Design a protein around this ligand. Structure first.
Ligand SMILES: Nc1ncnc2c1ncn2[C@@H]1O[C@H](COP(=O)(O)OP(=O)(O)O)[C@@H](O)[C@H]1O
Ligand SMILES: Nc1ncnc2c1ncn2[C@@H]1O[C@H](COP(=O)(O)OP(=O)(O)O)[C@@H](O)[C@H]1O
Lengths: 116, 116
C-alpha cells in the first residue's frame, strides 16, 4: 500500500459510511478517525515541517499523491517507490487499537507500595 | 482594519518584497514573517480548533475573508463587524518587536544571589 502514512489517511472516508448504534460507538469511531492521521503527522513533524498542513494537503490531493518527507515535496508514492507492506500496517493498527481501547476502560488502578 | 488577526496575516506578502542586506537581516525578516501568524493561531487555538489549518485557509482565501472564531466559520470580516483599531495593532506589534529583539541579543545575564 502507499507509504508515508497515507494508507491510513485514505481510509478516513471509509469511516464516514458507518452508522454508530449509540453515542459511545460514535465517540469510538471519532477516536479512530482522529487517530488515523497520526503516522503521517509524526513523519512530517520529524522532518521539521508542520504535520497538520502536510496531512491537509495530502487529503485534499488525489488518491495517488502523498508526501515525500525525505525529498520534502508532494509526489506519487507508487512511482517514487514509497510503499509499505499492508500486513505491517494492519497489524500495527489492530494491536495498538486493541490494547489502548482496553486501557481506556479503567476506573481503578491498584499498585504495590514501594517497599524497596 | 480586519479583526481576528487577519490584518497582520495580510501583511505577510509585504515582507516578500524586501531585500535583506546580509544573512542576519534575512533571519530577522523571517522571524517577523513567522511571528505575523501568531495572533490568528492563538485565537483559533482558544476556540478549540487547529490554528495552523485555520491560518492556511485564511491565507489561501480572498483578502476580505477571515475566520469568525465565535461562530466558527469563514466569513467577511467587515460585513460581520469583526474589526480592530489599526493603532492598537501597530502599537502592539511595535512594542513587542522592540523589546523582544533587544532581549534576543544577550549573551550574559547577571542576577543577585538570593540572600532572602
Ligand atoms: N521517503 C519517505 N517519505 C515519506 N515517508 C516515508 C519515507 N520513507 C519511509 N517513510 C514512512 O516511514 C515509516 C517507517 O518509519 P519507521 O521508523 O520504520 O517506523 P516503524 O518502525 O513503525 O515502521 C513507513 O510507514 C513509511 O511509510
Ligand atoms: N468573533 C470573533 N472572531 C474572530 N476574532 C475575534 C472575534 N472577536 C474578537 N476577535 C479578535 O480577538 C482579539 C481580541 O482579543 P483580546 O482578548 O482583546 O486580546 P487583546 O487584549 O490583545 O486585544 C482582536 O484582535 C480581535 O480581532
Amino acid at each position: 500500500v502507499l507509504g508515508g502514512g497515507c494508507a491510513l489517511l485514505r481510509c478516513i472516508p471509509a469511516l464516514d459510511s458507518l452508522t454508530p448504534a449509540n453515542e459511545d460507538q460514535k465517540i469510538g469511531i471519532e477516536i479512530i478517525k482522529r487517530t488515523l492521521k497520526i503516522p503521517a503527522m509524526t513523519i512530517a513533524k520529524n522532518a521539521g515541517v508542520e504535520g497538520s498542513l502536510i496531512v491537509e494537503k495530502i487529503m485534499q490531493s488525489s488518491s495517488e499523491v502523498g508526501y515525500d518527507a525525505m525529498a520534502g515535496d508532494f509526489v506519487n508514492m507508487v512511482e517514487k517507490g514509497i510503499i509499505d507492506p499492508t500486513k505491517v500496517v494492519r497489524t500495527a493498527l489492530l494491536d495498538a487499537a486493541g490494547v489502548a481501547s482496553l486501557l481506556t476502560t479503567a476506573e481503578v488502578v491498584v499498585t504495590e507500595i514501594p517497599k524497596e
